[PDB]
Amino acid sequence: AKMRISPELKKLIEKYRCVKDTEGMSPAKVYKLVGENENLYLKMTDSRYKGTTYDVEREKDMMLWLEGKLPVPKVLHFERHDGWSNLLMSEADGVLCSEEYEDEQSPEKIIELYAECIRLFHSIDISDCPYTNSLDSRLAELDYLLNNDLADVDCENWEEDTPFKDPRELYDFLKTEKPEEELVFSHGDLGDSNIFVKDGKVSGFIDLGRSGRADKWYDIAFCVRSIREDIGEEQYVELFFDLLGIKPDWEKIKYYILLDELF
Amino acid sequence: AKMRISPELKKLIEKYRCVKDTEGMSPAKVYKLVGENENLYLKMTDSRYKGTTYDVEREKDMMLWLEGKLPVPKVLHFERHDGWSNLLMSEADGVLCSEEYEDEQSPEKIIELYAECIRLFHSIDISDCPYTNSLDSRLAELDYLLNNDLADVDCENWEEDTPFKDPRELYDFLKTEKPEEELVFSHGDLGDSNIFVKDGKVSGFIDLGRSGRADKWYDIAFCVRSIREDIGEEQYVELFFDLLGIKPDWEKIKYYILLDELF
Numbered sequence: 001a002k003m004r005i006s007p008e009l010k011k012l013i014e015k016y017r018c019v020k021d022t023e024g025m026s027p028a029k030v031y032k033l034v035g036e037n038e039n040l041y042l043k044m045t046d047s048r049y050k051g052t053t054y055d056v057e058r059e060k061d062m063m064l065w066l067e068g069k070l071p072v073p074k075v076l077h078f079e080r081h082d083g084w085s086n087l088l089m090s091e092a093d094g095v096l097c098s099e100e101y102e103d104e105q106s107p108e109k110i111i112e113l114y115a116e117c118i119r120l121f122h123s124i125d126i127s128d129c130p131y132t133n134s135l136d137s138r139l140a141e142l143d144y145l146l147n148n149d150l151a152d153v154d155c156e157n158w159e160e161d162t163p164f165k166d167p168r169e170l171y172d173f174l175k176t177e178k179p180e181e182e183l184v185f186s187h188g189d190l191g192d193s194n195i196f197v198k199d200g201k202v203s204g205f206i207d208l209g210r211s212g213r214a215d216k217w218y219d220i221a222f223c224v225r226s227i228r229e230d231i232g233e234e235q236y237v238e239l240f241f242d243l244l245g246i247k248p249d250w251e252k253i254k255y256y257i258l259l260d261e262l263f
Numbered sequence: 264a265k266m267r268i269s270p271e272l273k274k275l276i277e278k279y280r281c282v283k284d285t286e287g288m289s290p291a292k293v294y295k296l297v298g299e300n301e302n303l304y305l306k307m308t309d310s311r312y313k314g315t316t317y318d319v320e321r322e323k324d325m326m327l328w329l330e331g332k333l334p335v336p337k338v339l340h341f342e343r344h345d346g347w348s349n350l351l352m353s354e355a356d357g358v359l360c361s362e363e364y365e366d367e368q369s370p371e372k373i374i375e376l377y378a379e380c381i382r383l384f385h386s387i388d389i390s391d392c393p394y395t396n397s398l399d400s401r402l403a404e405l406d407y408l409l410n411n412d413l414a415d416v417d418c419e420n421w422e423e424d425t426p427f428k429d430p431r432e433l434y435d436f437l438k439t440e441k442p443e444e445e446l447v448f449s450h451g452d453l454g455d456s457n458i459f460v461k462d463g464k465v466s467g468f469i470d471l472g473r474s475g476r477a478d479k480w481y482d483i484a485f486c487v488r489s490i491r492e493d494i495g496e497e498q499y500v501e502l503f504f505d506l507l508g509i510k511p512d513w514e515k516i517k518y519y520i521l522l523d524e525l526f
């Protein structure tokens with residue numbers, strides 16, 4: 001009777017053995033489905049996230065549009081079912097970036113990876129991109145998340161050392177300090193758990209709900225954040241920009257890093 | 264202004280470093296608050312769980328009542344704020360059982376442990392217990408949870424080899440096969456993740472939202488389930504019952520194991 005997945009989807013997933021992904025960092029439900037020939041992945045988001053960058057439907061649209069443009073998983077099945085948005089996809093090719101690195105430190109290799117991602121993204125034609133994740137679009141949804149108590153679970157935002165007394169004060173800041181934008185393909189959440197590597201080169205991208213048109217400093221800022229909190233040495237933030245062949249815009253960088261605090 | 268915690272509580276935890284719990288296999292948000300001299304814990308549940316065995320307020324009431332009866336964390340602060348039930352507590356004394364016996368091949372000691380918890384519980388006077396978790400009560404809230412899509416849909420249930428085809432079929436079974444109850448003190452979720460041992464003796468119980476009056480076979484059944492999950496040696500189940508000094512009632516043991524499937 002009442003279920004989160006349709007009988008057809010259940011039929012498609014029956015031959016597989018399920019293993020709920022143990023991470024917990026977003027509202028989405030991620031399940032690894034192990035089979036005798038391959039593994040599939042089922043990602044799901046509830047009604048409260050409809051139309052937001054968290055919505056797997058939006059993620060599915062981007063995943064379909066990115067085929068032949070970026071190495072991304074194949075869309076096997078998508079559905080809207082009893083409030084839920086369900087996506088069945090293929091497993092990404094290669095090794096997860098966070099694994100290839102882990103303890104075996106190869107700093108330069110990570111920076112090169114991030115640089116490779118940025119250049120690759122800039123070569124992508126966005127003339128027919130299904131989504132425009134402009135600051136106005138992001139702020140509008142952030143307002144929605146705050147009004148409905150759906151914004152990121154405050155744990156760090158409770159500390160005294162927080163620059164903004166509350167989410168709204170941070171929101172107001174982002175709304176007033178909104179910088180100019182130059183739309184380019186944007187991943188939306190460039191990080192070590194969303195990138196896959198094979199033979200030193202990017203082999204795949206996942207977590208595409210926040211992907212679409214956005215300013216180029218958005219992803220760049222994320223790389224900076226990743227480099228600083230994953231590697232450690234600020235010298236690799238220097239190498240990062242050397243590889244890109246540009247000078248860092250710290251004002252725009254600090255802003256985008258701030259924009260992601262509430263998500 | 265809009266916050267999940269009150270100004271008072273925010274002030275009470277400023278000197279602590281918040282680190283969100285990795286398990287998160289429930290609706291409740293758990294945060295380890297790292298201080299210089301000690302660690303505190305903050306558990307919180309949203310309004311959709313109000314009045315259920317998940318509601319941390321219900322957990323607070325049982326934590327206060329259990330003081331002096333069972334080794335439990337101290338209630339430092341509680342409050343209902345914007346629909347959120349918030350509980351600030353002290354760190355449990357001793358070592359987590361899933362760590363004291365972490366990969367440590369000593370399955371007999373964890374049995375002795377469970378046997379002791381059961382013995383402890385049967386010594387607790389329940390005459391003035393705050394909650395009665397009778398099957399009527401449990402099935403009533405389960406009904407509410409299923410209707411509102413708040414129950415736990417263990418992804419493993421989507422396998423082609425599973426017993427019940429959907430949540431309601433299992434519910435109808437639980438509603439029809441309801442055994443006879445003899446009330447005693449029940450933890451509600453007796454497992455290696457909610458028990459602490461210090462010197463070969465239970466030093467702390469946590470996760471008390473499901474605590475109250477219930478049939479004795481409930482906690483005992485949970486012990487059987489965990490015993491079987493650790494090792495495929497049914498011999499240890501016999502040992503457990505030798506320690507308890509009773510003949511196992513399989514119809515009730517099976518019944519309670521199934522009841523926990525949707526929670």
Ligand SMILES: Nc1ncnc2c1ncn2[C@@H]1O[C@H](COP(=O)(O)OP(=O)(O)NP(=O)(O)O)[C@@H](O)[C@H]1O
Pocket residue numbers: 021023024025026027028030041043073089090091092096189193194206207
């Ligand atoms: N198609 C896939 N191929 C391989 N691994 C996958 C795939 N989908 C998900 N995963 C794995 O599961 C994790 C979580 O999936 P993800 O799509 O990032 O969910 P999420 O909650 O949006 N993640 P985040 O927001 O980064 O916490 C990823 O880091 C991978 O480890």
Ligand SMILES: Nc1ncnc2c1ncn2[C@@H]1O[C@H](COP(=O)(O)OP(=O)(O)NP(=O)(O)O)[C@@H](O)[C@H]1O
Pocket residue numbers: 284286287288289290291293304306336352353354355359452456457469470
């Ligand atoms: N007072 C405490 N002292 C020590 N550790 C604690 C305390 N409260 C929570 N924890 C830790 O955090 C984990 C989750 O807390 P718990 O109260 O079990 O939340 P939960 O989501 O109800 N858990 P479960 O339903 O078992 O998944 C516990 O297994 C402990 O590791």
Ligand SMILES: [Mg+2]
Pocket residue numbers: 193194206207
């Ligand atoms: Mg991700």
Ligand SMILES: [Mg+2]
Pocket residue numbers: 026189207
């Ligand atoms: Mg994500």
Ligand SMILES: [Mg+2]
Pocket residue numbers: 456457469470
């Ligand atoms: Mg627990």
Ligand SMILES: [Mg+2]
Pocket residue numbers: 289452470
């Ligand atoms: Mg629990």
